[PDB]
Amino acid sequence: MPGKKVVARVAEAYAEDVGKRVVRVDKYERAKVGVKVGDYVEVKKV
């Protein structure tokens, strides 16, 4: 696929977020991915 992929390091979820299919991403990754809080993303291994 063309262009630079957005790659991030996996860290464990905070306990209260576990089991909610949520991924915490900061504003810098959100800008590059092109998403806002509440949007959905695909996550896959590098």
Next chain:
Amino acid sequence: GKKVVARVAEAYAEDVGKRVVRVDKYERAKVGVKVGDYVEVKKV
């Protein structure tokens, strides 16, 4: 591994600027990653 879909939530302040994504044990197992591995994140 496989591709998963998750809802985006804000990062905690201490995680900001470290290129970190917080993913729970369920998504990690499905994706085929462990803590410290890298993932690609894409808008859907």
